[model samples]
Target: FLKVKNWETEVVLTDTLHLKSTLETGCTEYICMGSIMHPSQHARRPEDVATKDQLFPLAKEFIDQYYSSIKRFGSKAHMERLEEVNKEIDTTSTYQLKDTELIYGAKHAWRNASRCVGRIQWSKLQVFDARDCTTAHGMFNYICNHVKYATNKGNLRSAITIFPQRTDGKHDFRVWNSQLIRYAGYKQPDGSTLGDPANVQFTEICIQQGWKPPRGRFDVLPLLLQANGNDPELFQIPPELVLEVPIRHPKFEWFKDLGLKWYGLPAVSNMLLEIGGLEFSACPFSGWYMGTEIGVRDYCDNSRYNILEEVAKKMNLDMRKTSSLWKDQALVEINIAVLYSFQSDKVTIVDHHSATESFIKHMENEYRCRGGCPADWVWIVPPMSGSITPVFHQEMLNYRLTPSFEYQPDPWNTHVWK
Candidate 1:
């Protein structure tokens, strides 16, 4: 007999244990010695925890995978040097990556992103290395360049600006914005929300940090950047650099009076870019808009703008009757307006139907090239007219992969944790 405590609770085990019992109880394998016992367990950690020697395998895996993917595995000297670097790293230190490796890894991370339906353009991503930046102001300048290069005068390009990586167990840099271009949501005294409801907590933090709240429906929030675990500093983005599309229905001239607009780029700034066991917390990446991302979820969701009821009333649809499908009708027109507005402004935006079709193509290509493609069905499927898309009928599996992007705790929240 053997005794084991899975945490504080004790359990007794016989010498001849049934495999089924252990497997059924979520124990994969257990080892026991004379009068001693050990139980297998899965434990969560604070960050991507790995020693310098442990990082070698992870980095080598990514290097081989990336090199092979691009059909440039012939560089024996580069591979040898990478291995040497990994070996030279002490147990307490981090292995530094070259610019080429970082760029390739960043692009591949987008490719392996299970939730992104926009992976068709993964190979075309432009990576800007800003790891040398040591201050909040320096980070803001690189971010501005990223925005300028990505926005591209409305012909938006997919780009990522990577800042300093975590080293010596200290987080050196972080971007506090959920995204580079997001509307500030102010919770009014009457319980109504102004701007984006999703950004209420972030907006509150901005105000607490001395940023004056603007009285408008779509005020662009400034960049809040942190360096060396210091308090975040706010930097306002120039309004002229942000290209916004005015909402207007193709046929209904009354729609323009609603005075709704959105910035051209959707640059996600809060995600950590994990490449080869290294974590870059200050990386901000952007891709062009998918109309439904803005029109359906952003504009139509009850928790968001909740504009469906108002639009339905404008269109004279019977809002009181559930069978009238007022919400559905209004949603379609709103999406159409988003598409038409972006097209009229010569901005890069994909309609939901077209975006879904492209995702299907991406799936096919990934399957043929990589044996399998991981995807989250809930995210891959569009918010409106979901059943009409080819991806609606397809089954998907979401799984973890290295050289990936991951959502992290807000900088302020993490500060509290510290």
Candidate 2:
């Protein structure tokens, strides 16, 4: 017997026959047979549990939605036999999606990703299907290609290369870097730190896996790739292949003395790409950076570089006076320096103003095509000048739409042997 509770009501079921018998027996208001109850504010009917029969229809719905949105709709026969194909596969394992289906799903996932601000280039994304790669070395070679292609000699291009998907309760491939390019952060003895504080734990893992710690603020960490439950391997990225910009102010000569620099491209590597209920665990994607992401948030955030006070002092601003806006003044200059440096180095980067403007245009384009655009207002607005952008005044609705990219727990956090 099972007891189901919903708010102030409860219903008991002895078996499947009992559930069917009691469906309309004055317990319909409280009990939903054959479905699990969810704790929400209002009482609602629980959805039927997914089975092989249900999975095919759900897959078909998304497949049709994707192909229709892209205007490539000529798969009636394939859609009709989707259920038959699933039955042909072992009943214990899920059916596999075709390579073409996987490619289209990946592109649409990027298009549907809510938090990404650079969705303007959604259609231009290059997808590399690497499901056949079974070795860490093979994963490294694909990653190297992804980095080189996306880096594009400083003219950054958006791209995603997908590896094998998870199956039979096992992950076949994984990329350990949070981003393809990130600085190593070394914690010092005096509670201070060098490099990016965000990468401290990742740095430790790399060291444990036999990577030589450079112990520098700007040292580029190697790529950590794992395949088929084997130990992770490290691959060093060629310095020449990486385009770095030496930050300098447009007017302040002393700013160059700070010796701060950052990589040109920001390619995120640790996100899982989900499409048609399948999870691609080793997909890495890249987009060009917006200046404030590097300048205001990365360099000036309190928990990050925290250079506001230093910059204020260097600019000769009155630090003690709250009304003087020393931090604000310094922040603007730092942002200006980021833009100037990227431009001078011939690397592709967008200023906040231009980026926000592009986002508005992207929304308009999406609205005309899809009838609605999903966005996160907090992320869509620039960190430095939130109210000034058009997106600030525009209300946004956030919701889940798949195929989509989703964050997964770090591998180290889930390692069983640790």
Candidate 3:
């Protein structure tokens, strides 16, 4: 559709292209944008202790509404349990109980508070006492906080859990191994335990402090794991590690087509089982994940159209861009599109050597008429005028227009409607 009078010049100009021009190009750009948009916020979940601004309000609302809609046959017993837990919290705050009371109260409070989730089959718990607890509190905190963080951020599927521990005398297997092993239990060294079925140390432990990746959740643990033993200087944030899995929707296929990978699968069978490290779980809430709604929508829309009519205008611009006669092609395309779509064909094209003058005029008119700009956007006429002069650089041009006709205007002289 673009009929160029000078095809040779067009071919020569095309050589200046420095970036990819197809879907691949757009896909790469979008991938980068998605990564930045969804960086991991697990480290700040559960709200900051210092600033009591927790995401608990949302969760609490969910719980309250869920209970209100359900039968309250056993509600009295549940309320009693809640009161008992609250009493323990009060006693813990007062130091009426020993230091263990703090840990017990904190853990118990989280469990009791979250019981409402279990009632709905949306969550579960694996309680571990000191004897069976091989992992530390930090692991559980990481998992729990990461889940809370993801939820508050945007209903993203995230998880946390405790790590399982193994014990062998020589290597001190009490610590969790970075890699998975086939054998569930420990083996004694020096050929003592091998081939002796009775000597096997096996226990079906469920409440260890560690989390596997949730099914369909992205696996970011590898990136963190890689940072563990390596020299700190060599470590860098892997770009892929920074991602948020959006709720699956038909519209979101565009993002997935751009090469954003999902991590939830066989690797992370149950998200609830994976324990978040201490740093993740104990992170104080900072309100970091708030106030991004408009920016996100604009980013997703590429700032092209905030309304349906604007989108139609953009389509018309694309059509006009195909016309090769204009010197300032993009501007000419847009103006033509606007004229046709809005039935403004009567508007004359004002050609100027310095095209910025025409552009500013067009933009100013649209800003005023369409309510696209602030009310105070006044047309600041330059001191110079003519075809060759740029608006900013024009010199010695008179701008006699006033905010009101009281500057002595004849209605006929000021009117542009004619």
Candidate 4:
């Protein structure tokens, strides 16, 4: 409940507010503390063809995994297919994957997701292949189709829409926003963010790119789709396609008066999809929400909405005393409210308790099937009920596996020639 130093004023102040100050001071580099806390090797991508001497081996490894996955490992089909890909890479510096292979690769990536607690639903994902998209307009059409299909009128399906793989690095496809759906953030006169503080920079970028800002706290942000390394084009997702859950308490009727809501789809758009040594840098993945992700994380996080104080005050709890456990009390109710609200609205949402239990089952299944499951306990444990979460007592190992979802450099930060 206490920090020796206030990151809100110290580290956080430097992050968003002092970027220009540091730039003028000639300190152009900055690093995130989270990156330090959870670190792993970056995936090898295309355009580093000079490394193809090892790419064939990487491709072979994935092909072997794929064959074994289908229970055909070392069979004639497997052996001959390996030679085909091996020769393809040797001649053209890259190879193609069959559609079935792409489908399984996407599922395998989810199964090996180290930071995701929802990996129990991995194999059930819907992978939408949009690999032939050559323009941002085409990207938007496919994205809208995915949004509608995955939304499923609140029955939210786990899905990923794969864009073309980065062939030359000079001509890459990308979805600029962190998530496929997010709210706009406005910088007020007093250095306050009116909507989501996390999205102020992206919101500003949208305004700069000729899109008019409604200046509303909860306006859905537009998509910035980049195809063929071109400047990203802004596309506003159709409002009806984006299902959102309004915050409401099952017991306290006043909770809905606060006017807080969260989008249903949790689709991350910037993560690269690595399969059989081929990388699709613009594949966006989505899954149904777990209660804590919206309640404890989105609303309660000081870096996010910082609503615990307000909720505690609303509940008439003693905020002046740390021993009162007002924050903890507020968190439980907020989490309960989210679960009740989403379920009442017929939306697909899971509570942390059930989510972790299923994850525990998933780990056991993985252990029996593959002898090991890669997990980072920090992410598996819910932030609200740390000690009571099923994964809190479990010792899990952390490691990388591919075909996997690899986080990529943001489109704007990378080479985007206008």
User: Which candidate ranks first by TM-score, i.e. highest?
Assistant: 4
**Highest lDDT, which number?**
4
Residue 361 lDDT (model 2)? 76
Comparing 1 and 3 on lDDT, the stronger one = 1
**Which is the better candidate, 3 or 4, if ranked by lDDT?**
4
TM-score result, candidate 1: 0.85
Give one digit per residue, the lDDT tens place, for model 4 in 1-418: 1111122223110112111110011112484233244353444543455366767877888888889878899999899999999788778888888899999999988887778999988889898999889999999999999999999999898899999987768788989999999988888998777888899999999999988999987889999999998888999998999999898998998999989899888989878888877888899888889889889888888877889988998899988889999999999999999999999899999988899889877876776566567676767888878767667766665556677777666677766466
Tell me each candidate's RMSD, in Å, in order. 10.4, 10.6, 27.8, 9.6
Model 1: per-residue Cα lDDT over 185-251, one tens digit each: 9889999999889999999888988999875799899899987666788999887789899999999
Tens digits of lDDT, candidate 2, 86-170: 6733374445677777777888788776567888888888888788899999998898888899888888888888888776434
- Model 3: residues with Cα > 4 Å off, grouped in runs: 1-70, 93-132, 136-265, 269-418
lDDT of 3 by residue, 32-79 (tens): 322232222332124212121222232233233333435542488446
Q: Give every collision pair in model 1.
A: none
Q: In model 4, state the lDDT of residue 76.
A: 100
TM-score (all chains, Cα) for each model: 0.85, 0.84, 0.20, 0.89
- Number of backbone-clashing residue pairs for each candidate, in the order shown: 0, 0, 31, 0
Error of 2 at 335 (Å): 0.6
Model 3 TM-score (2 dp): 0.20
